[PDB]
């Protein structure tokens with residue numbers, strides 16, 4: 001078995017290997033990359049996502065989200081308070097302000113210490129989940145707006161044609177902006193490209209151990225667990241690396257820098273934080289190996305998780321017994 005300790009693997013594809021996206025994912029899996037739940041891909045030196053980032057300031061962030069924490073430094077939830085619209089240039093100025101900017105630090109490990117010590121005492125503002133793309137249309141390799149769709153994959157594997165669409169999303173971050181512990185909708189893959197700015201630190205639990213994280217979470221968030229049998233689908237709970245280690249939960253960590261891709265694998269729980277002003281693009285995707293995970297994915301039906309239009313067909317075809325209850329949660 002390849003990668004039996006479930007370490008995060010880093011890949012350096014050549015320009016020739018960067019042509020065929022599906023083939024390269026399958027290659028990474030042949031080497032055991034999926035066992036970690038997360039892999040890093042450093043693009044060939046010849047590649048670029050677009051020519052420059054000099055002209056992005058007028059993108060609108062219609063609903064910036066202030067991430068307000070509750071709990072203790074290593075075990076907390078966050079809620080999202082909606083703020084007034086602002087442009088990317090306005091948001092960048094805000095991220096760089098004395099109130100929000102990255103503190104002085106020695107290295108990524110010092111900054112990570114400072115994040116976990118101090119996160120809960122601040123409420124950073126995240127421009128998340130903005131439909132759109134920063135890849136140039138002429139970028140032919142690893143262009144996250146030009147990937148094979150999940151609907152087409154399901155149709156190819158299973159023969160059933162379904163409604164729905166699959167487009168990327170932009171994320172504008174600042175110091176301390178946080179992504180809570182989660183797997184993707186329907187335990188899909190994700191791919192995330194850090195277009196510009198400061199790094200993103202990731203934490204990940206191997207897919208084979210995801211239920212250990214779920215059992216800890218039920219213990220640490222006992223009210224939430226009574227409310228919903230899949231409350232991590234709400235994407236609000238944070239648990240620090242120190243608390244994971246104290247409870248024997250297997251995990252790994254890695255920092256993504258500008259110009260790098262990350263892939264999350266089916267049922268790989270992940271969480272993390274941004275170091276300072278940045279912009280990332282991400283999208284879900286599927287492969288043949290996903291189908292069995294999609295069939296077994298948990299679902300929130302309490303009403304909290306509310307998701308896209310396109311998840312309806314995935315539930316309906318892959319999980320017909322659960323469909324009626326899940327759809328009630330949607331309505």
Ligand SMILES: O=C(O)CNC(=O)C(=O)O
Nearest residue numbers: 171179190191192280282
């Ligand atoms: O970058 C973020 O805020 C969160 N991203 C992801 O969870 C992802 O790409 O799967």
Ligand SMILES: [Mg+2]
Nearest residue numbers: 056057058059
């Ligand atoms: Mg612009």
Ligand code: NI
Nearest residue numbers: 183184190264
């Ligand atoms: Ni994710």
Ligand SMILES: [Zn+2]
Nearest residue numbers: 228300302304
């Ligand atoms: Zn729920």
